[PDB]
Amino acid sequence: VERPASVVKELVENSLDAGATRIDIDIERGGAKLIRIRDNGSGIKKDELALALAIASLDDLEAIISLGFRGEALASISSVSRLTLTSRTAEQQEAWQAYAVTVKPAAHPVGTTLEVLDLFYNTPARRKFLRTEKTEFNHIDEIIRRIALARFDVTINLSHNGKIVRQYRAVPEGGQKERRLGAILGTAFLEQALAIEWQHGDLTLRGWVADPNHTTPALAEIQYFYVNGRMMRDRLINHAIRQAYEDKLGADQQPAFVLYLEIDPHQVSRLVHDFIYQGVLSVLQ
Amino acid sequence: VERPASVVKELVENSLDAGATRIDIDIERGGAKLIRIRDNGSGIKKDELALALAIASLDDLEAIISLGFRGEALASISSVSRLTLTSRTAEQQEAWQAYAVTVKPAAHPVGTTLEVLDLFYNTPARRKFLRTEKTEFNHIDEIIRRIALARFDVTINLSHNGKIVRQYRAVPEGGQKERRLGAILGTAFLEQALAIEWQHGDLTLRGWVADPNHTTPALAEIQYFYVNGRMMRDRLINHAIRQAYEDKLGADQQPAFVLYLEIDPHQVSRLVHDFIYQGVLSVLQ
Amino acid sequence: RQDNLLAAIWQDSKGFGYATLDISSGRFRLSEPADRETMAAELQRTNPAELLYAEDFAEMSLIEGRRGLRRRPLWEFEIDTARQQLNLQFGTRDLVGFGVENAPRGLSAAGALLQYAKCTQRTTLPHIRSITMEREQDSIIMDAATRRNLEITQNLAGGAENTLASVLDSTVTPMGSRMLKRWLHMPVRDTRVLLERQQTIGALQDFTAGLQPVLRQVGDLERILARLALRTARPRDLARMRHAFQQLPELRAQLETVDSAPVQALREKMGEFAELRDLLERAIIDTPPVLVRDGGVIASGYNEELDEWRALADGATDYLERLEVRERERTGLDTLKVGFNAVHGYYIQISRGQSHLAPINYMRRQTLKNAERYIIPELKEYEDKVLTSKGKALALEKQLYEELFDLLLPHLEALQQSASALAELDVLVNLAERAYTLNYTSPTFIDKPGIRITEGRHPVVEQVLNEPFIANPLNLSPQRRMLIITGPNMGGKSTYMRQTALIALMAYIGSYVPAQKVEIGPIDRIFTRVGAFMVEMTETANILHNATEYSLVLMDEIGRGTSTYDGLSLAWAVAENLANKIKALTLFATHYFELTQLPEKMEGVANVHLDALEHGDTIAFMHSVQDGAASKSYGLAVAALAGVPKEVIKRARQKLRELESIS
Amino acid sequence: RQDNLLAAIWQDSKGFGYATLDISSGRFRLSEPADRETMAAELQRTNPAELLYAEDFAEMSLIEGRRGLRRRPLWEFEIDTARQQLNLQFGTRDLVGFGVENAPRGLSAAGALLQYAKCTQRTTLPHIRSITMEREQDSIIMDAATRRNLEITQNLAGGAENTLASVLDSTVTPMGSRMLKRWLHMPVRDTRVLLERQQTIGALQDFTAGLQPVLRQVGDLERILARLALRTARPRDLARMRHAFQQLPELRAQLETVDSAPVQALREKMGEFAELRDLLERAIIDTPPVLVRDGGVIASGYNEELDEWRALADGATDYLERLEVRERERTGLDTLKVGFNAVHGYYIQISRGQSHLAPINYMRRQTLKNAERYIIPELKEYEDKVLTSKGKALALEKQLYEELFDLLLPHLEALQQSASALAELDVLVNLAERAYTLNYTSPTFIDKPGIRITEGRHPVVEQVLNEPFIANPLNLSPQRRMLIITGPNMGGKSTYMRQTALIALMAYIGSYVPAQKVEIGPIDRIFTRVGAFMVEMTETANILHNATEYSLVLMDEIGRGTSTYDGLSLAWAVAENLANKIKALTLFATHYFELTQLPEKMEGVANVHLDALEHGDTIAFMHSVQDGAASKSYGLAVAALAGVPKEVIKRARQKLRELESIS
Ligand SMILES: Nc1ncnc2c1ncn2[C@@H]1O[C@H](COP(=O)(O)OP(=O)(O)NP(=O)(O)O)[C@@H](O)[C@H]1O
Numbered sequence A, B: 001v002e003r004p005a006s007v008v009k010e011l012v013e014n015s016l017d018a019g020a021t022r023i024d025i026d027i028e029r030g031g032a033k034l035i036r037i038r039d040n041g042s043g044i045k046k047d048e049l050a051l052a053l054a055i056a057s058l059d060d061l062e063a064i065i066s067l068g069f070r071g072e073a074l075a076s077i078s079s080v081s082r083l084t085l086t087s088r089t090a091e092q093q094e095a096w097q098a099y100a101v102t103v104k105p106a107a108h109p110v111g112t113t114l115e116v117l118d119l120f121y122n123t124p125a126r127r128k129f130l131r132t133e134k135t136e137f138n139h140i141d142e143i144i145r146r147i148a149l150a151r152f153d154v155t156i157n158l159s160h161n162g163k164i165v166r167q168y169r170a171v172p173e174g175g176q177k178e179r180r181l182g183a184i185l186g187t188a189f190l191e192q193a194l195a196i197e198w199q200h201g202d203l204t205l206r207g208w209v210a211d212p213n214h215t216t217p218a219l220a221e222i223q224y225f226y227v228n229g230r231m232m233r234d235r236l237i238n239h240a241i242r243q244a245y246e247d248k249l250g251a252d253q254q255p256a257f258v259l260y261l262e263i264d265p266h267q268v269s270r271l272v273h274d275f276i277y278q279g280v281l282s283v284l285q
Numbered sequence C, D: 001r002q003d004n005l006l007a008a009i010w011q012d013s014k015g016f017g018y019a020t021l022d023i024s025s026g027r028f029r030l031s032e033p034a035d036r037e038t039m040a041a042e043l044q045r046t047n048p049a050e051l052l053y054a055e056d057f058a059e060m061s062l063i064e065g066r067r068g069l070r071r072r073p074l075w076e077f078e079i080d081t082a083r084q085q086l087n088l089q090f091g092t093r094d095l096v097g098f099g100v101e102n103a104p105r106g107l108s109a110a111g112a113l114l115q116y117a118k119c120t121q122r123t124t125l126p127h128i129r130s131i132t133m134e135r136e137q138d139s140i141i142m143d144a145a146t147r148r149n150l151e152i153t154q155n156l157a158g159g160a161e162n163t164l165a166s167v168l169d170s171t172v173t174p175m176g177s178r179m180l181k182r183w184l185h186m187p188v189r190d191t192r193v194l195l196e197r198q199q200t201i202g203a204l205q206d207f208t209a210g211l212q213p214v215l216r217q218v219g220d221l222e223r224i225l226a227r228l229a230l231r232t233a234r235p236r237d238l239a240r241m242r243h244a245f246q247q248l249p250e251l252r253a254q255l256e257t258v259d260s261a262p263v264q265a266l267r268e269k270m271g272e273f274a275e276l277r278d279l280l281e282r283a284i285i286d287t288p289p290v291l292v293r294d295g296g297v298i299a300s301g302y303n304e305e306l307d308e309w310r311a312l313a314d315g316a317t318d319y320l321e322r323l324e325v326r327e328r329e330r331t332g333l334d335t336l337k338v339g340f341n342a343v344h345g346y347y348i349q350i351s352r353g354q355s356h357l358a359p360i361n362y363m364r365r366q367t368l369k370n371a372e373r374y375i376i377p378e379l380k381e382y383e384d385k386v387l388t389s390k391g392k393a394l395a396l397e398k399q400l401y402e403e404l405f406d407l408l409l410p411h412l413e414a415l416q417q418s419a420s421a422l423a424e425l426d427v428l429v430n431l432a433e434r435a436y437t438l439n440y441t442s443p444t445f446i447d448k449p450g451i452r453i454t455e456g457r458h459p460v461v462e463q464v465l466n467e468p469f470i471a472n473p474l475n476l477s478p479q480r481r482m483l484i485i486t487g488p489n490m491g492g493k494s495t496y497m498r499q500t501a502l503i504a505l506m507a508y509i510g511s512y513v514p515a516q517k518v519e520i521g522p523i524d525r526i527f528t529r530v531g532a533f534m535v536e537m538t539e540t541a542n543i544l545h546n547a548t549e550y551s552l553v554l555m556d557e558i559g560r561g562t563s564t565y566d567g568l569s570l571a572w573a574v575a576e577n578l579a580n581k582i583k584a585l586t587l588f589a590t591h592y593f594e595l596t597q598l599p600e601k602m603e604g605v606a607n608v609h610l611d612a613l614e615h616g617d618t619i620a621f622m623h624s625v626q627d628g629a630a631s632k633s634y635g636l637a638v639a640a641l642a643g644v645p646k647e648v649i650k651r652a653r654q655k656l657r658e659l660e661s662i663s
């Protein structure tokens, strides 16, 4: 939990794990001053709110710490900050809330909200470090951009300093996915997008690749690879694709792609390499 | 009661006869639309209000018509107009009021107020003959100017269209009368004013005369003569004074004067003539 | 059934005002027909058996074919008396409660008809009770209280903050902002035009971004055409016009693909104007100086003569350098420099030590402290050719510029049409974009009055607010025509109410609306009462006498009274009246509980309330509309939120249960 | 005898903001000292045993000799957190109820002192209850609610109608209007200066008329000096200045006779400026054109050279007339006229029938449809001498004009002083004239708080009323410190209240006041509550925490509530609090009758009410303040005044005595 980008990314994924379709994310001042997360993922009951943050209050209570792996992430944030949790459960309840040390009800829809002032509140330096302002947002902007292409099923609104910046609509199931692709990667990529659909046995490869013929300096900035959801930057795949862009046209310039791979557990194995390669090349011709 | 100037002058003197020291006079639109008279002269009791205007209602009531010589002037105005009398007596009372269809109490100080809208509710022509209104005010302006010099003891406020035009302050008894003389006749007359104090037996002559030596075209407009208060229409006095202006300096030009005479009667009698003449000439030298 | 009807009319040089009367029934209305056919249609309609006119009526052509005519004097049509007269007839001190207070052109007609009626009947006529206005723009309208109160284009304090405008107006051009703000002041109610707008607004959502920036280039074309017409137009105004004309091929292309025939129609209205672009391009520099006064506007290459006179002053600097250099070396004085002066013209200066070492060609024009300046015929010759050529080049420039007004004006109306089209498109696109940005939905229209909202939201408050709006539905109809609303403060009474107002207005400019799904019948008139006593009451009566079976009535806390009972009584009535007699679609916000007995008392009335969950030190306002009624006193609780010291809060609660221990 | 005190301070480049805290008692105040000596005096005064400062404090010279210093980080002084923090400490949503909401420079200091206190004590601190502002101008304090409500210079709708200004501002010059309006925004409370103004205002009443027109000649001298200073001043601005300078000998004379040493002092401040008058008189024409750009400004006789270059173009018209006449004679063509053209220069035109009958001297420059224009050498060389001389005469004119700025500016401050003096005199005279016009009286000041009015009147309403106002007295003191006011609507509650306000303000600019006789003690702060719920409550608390033993508190209809008892309870308290604890001079307008039991309950409270006389089916409002209390419900009665249909009024009275038959 060093950058605001990191606190953002994790607490954005806390709601995703709660089956979320809508996520509001609001910031002011690079993350230093404000961060607000609202989600429609399932909620936190009034018992579970208190001790998820407050650490001798665990002692007596009989392992209800269980429900809350965000509760792990929260506890670290809370001791040295100005945190405000507020949530109403999907289970017919009224909404309840935690501050700074008061628990009382307030009002909210089915889900959870988190409001915050600059995380470190008594550490002199770790704040004094916290990078610029502009750049911190530009990083957060990428955090959301990454998770956005990973999940076409969740609507995300990013705003900065009260003002809306980015509105990623969730595409309907079996819907027009070109909408969301242009929104995240600009219109320049969208209009050169050549889709890909390859399939051998368990392995399945879906996505888009910008036509090398019309790939310019602006487009080359788009290189993201996901495997059953998760992005690793493993150098292996670097070959498979730079092999593919070299083999269609000899000019080895920087490609533009966003590809989705679906296989059964085997962390990285050459099987995967040539599978990738053959998929892309057919598509370019 | 032909012009607004006439209805003004008479109802202005109704209050003077009631021992008035303060008179508010308000007009809109040459007198056509509005005329408002408020006075501090003694008031009209609640019995005396009704029958002074309404005419078989007098019969049974035992000669209380007596108190109200304005009641003569009021009755004529009222049958064919939109009149509003309102008054509280100096004696034992709350204020009472008459309109247009109702007698009821309202509020007012010690005295009387009269409010009115344009007369002739069905006479086509007699309204057509009320003047071009501009001139109607210029006439009313003179009405007040005449009665103003006649009574230095009564404060009069003349206004037109809500807006204050002329404020004649009542001079304290045995006070600085130069203040009121400049207000009524302009500062030009005031600074050339040579006072006069002549006295033979019963007869007494007091006032001012603009020095002929410095009498200009602007000043010559001031010629008013009063006798025990009352200004008459007598050619005789014309001689006495044009004799006086000829006899100091031969240049017979139009004089400027305002003189006050106090006697026992010689309605026009030569006694009065040479008395006037001798008073003025001594003063000029 | 054709009646004995009476009427009166007067005109000033502006337009007409009109009034009527039936002695059988005692009916009394007003109007202000603005033009001739409307005035003729209004006499046709009412068809008076008896018709009054002032001696000096100008447009006599309307009335000389009509029956039972009555010539009247002028003074009888004077507003002063008229107002005075009629005010004591109804007994009021003003005509605020009638909804005609500032319509004096009509009131002379009502004023003269009453002095005639006093004198036609000459007894009391208490079968004449009231007067009401019918409304010019009958896509019907919204009173002054609603307008100042709803802050659609202006707020509380008088800025443009927290406005419906502040949200909707992300229009790129000023002519968009105005027309956006105008459609709000005048909602469209021809059903056809509303649906035309929805079809257009929906088809643009794919092209939101692609179009927007193209229009921000235009600027205010409309106001530029103004100074063009006035002939006060300035260089940089014509410049941004050119920049606008260059966007036309672009917009023509982007809109041809869009699926909406109303879009294809507006695409034509836009136009192209190829030749007009050409002239401006050839005549003017990229961006000249501010005015035309000191030239530098017309580009070289438009006019040969322009460049001719420019060539005389362009033989300037090199002429004077060769002089300066020759004369410096001919005389042997190096401090010799040939310079210009605004005051005296050009000259040759030499420093004081070298000054009397100059040649006899030199004529003294200017002695100094530190030098001597001179003039020579070569310079004085050349002085003229520059100064004059400048002038005449400048003069030609002025000529050419004002001649362009002559060249453009023959299409002046065609350009206004394009300007209007573009202004409207910015509005349409902005709205297409606001529905894209804020997820509004497309509603439909029904036959008879009723509103159904599915999870609707207050479009202003939700955008300014900390948390997301607690969306609520609403279900109103001729069967369920009134809702008694009780509850806590900050319960969201006035909020749930005023939000309803916004839904209608928005739907009725053809735009999408803040809710899941919205269906709506006819609503003509939209009246409001805005907390604060003379003041409070007076406007209430207006809403009574004018509001109809199809209107929207908006009540919040009537009966800020002088006592316990006045307020209650007062209200009890107004409610029963709107349910029993008028039968309008109403929403009644109140604090006086006894009224909650009205769902049982009346047919068509049903209880609702904003429920609050009030707990320990704190309190929760669900911000949700619940079936049923309010609990209790919520003020004592809200007290501290102001900042009340407990000296007082505890004296409050110590007296509260002295009082509440009786009931 | 002595303390233990803590403080915090932060600065921006504008000024300072300050906050303090005592852990023994728990006292918490705010301020915004603007300059250095005030800031040094404020640290001197409070003398903290412990003093906080942000790392980056600029004016360190104040704090480096002080004891118990504590260097703090920057982020701790941020307003966002500070506000957030302190708001949850007191529990409120805002700091409206504290009367410091828009003083953020101070609030950073209060914000940082609390994060430190949280961390210095880390213990219970509910002995820290509130925060309040002390005000630089110990001279005045009137809150925003009073200001927007009293409409002294601006009314509800945003015009200048029905204002105290509309009446008082009969000032002849715009600089009078402003300063008149400014003294209203800031009442003077140095007793000395108030009496100086009364002496001046009284001595002018004989000279009301004589002076007035002299000042209307000046115009806005002040704003003219502005464009003078900026160097944007224009000819006609300097013209009206000259006209102003010509009135100075006149005013000097009229004021020397007046008996007031404050008048004799202001007569000096006016000054004369004989030499400055002389220059303008000699340099400029009576009234030149608008700007200097196109000349025609400097008069002939100021400058020899000016007239020299003018003599070249002065040999213009006669030169061309003799030509036109000689050539018309010589050729025999009478349609021959010598004219000018901006485009081509001068020419000689002849009508088409006579055109080819002209002499061979003529060179064609311009053929026309209906004429032929020609040029000749005499004309074409004379063309130059005119066009150039004009320019250089024009050029000299510009030079001379901007040089005048150099000539006047050495007295620029002395001129501002005269401009200020004259602006102030118009105000003083205007007020001397308003007391002359509207018969106001001269009041006197006393030791301890209290107002006595003898037949006083609401100075605005009486002028807008068609009638004299029902004048009433008022008698308040430390013994009789509160008045519970109940009654009918249009009774004159808010009127009798708001009128009281105007009296104080007027007296406290040294002006005469609408009453027979007025005596007054100290009143520091003037707070108000303005009818319309979240809104109404919040501002109430402000008035509580800030108002003092000497203040003026202005209450009308607090407790427009959610239920029966809330409103009542609420009020009951506020009243008791202001009588029991605070002990301020108060006036309490209410409609909740049970409060009229408070004269018996409290020491220092006494009943009054505006009595109404109801006769049958009409009603009279005495507009007079009576000892005792209100009768009843006056709303049912006022109902019809709106215009209520009797369907309702009779349902009202039919239910009214269903309700009133219990109580
Ligand atoms: N449904 C809602 N969801 C979220 N916030 C709301 C909702 N309704 C109201 N609010 C907020 O609550 C505040 C006050 O609500 P409001 O409707 O003014 O209360 P009220 O019942 O009219 N009583 P008062 O305003 O005190 O006379 C507003 O400023 C809104 O911003």
Ligand SMILES: Nc1ncnc2c1ncn2[C@@H]1O[C@H](COP(=O)(O)OP(=O)(O)NP(=O)(O)O)[C@@H](O)[C@H]1O
Pocket: C533, C534, C535, D461, D465, D468, D469, D470, D471, D472, D488, D489, D490, D491, D492, D493, D494, D495, D496, D623, D624
């Ligand atoms: N002393 C007075 N003399 C003459 N007219 C007055 C006087 N006092 C009040 N009025 C008029 O009476 C009306 C009532 O004033 P106001 O004080 O607002 O009444 P209120 O008791 O506050 N009730 P409301 O105005 O209905 O809220 C106004 O129209 C004033 O012009």
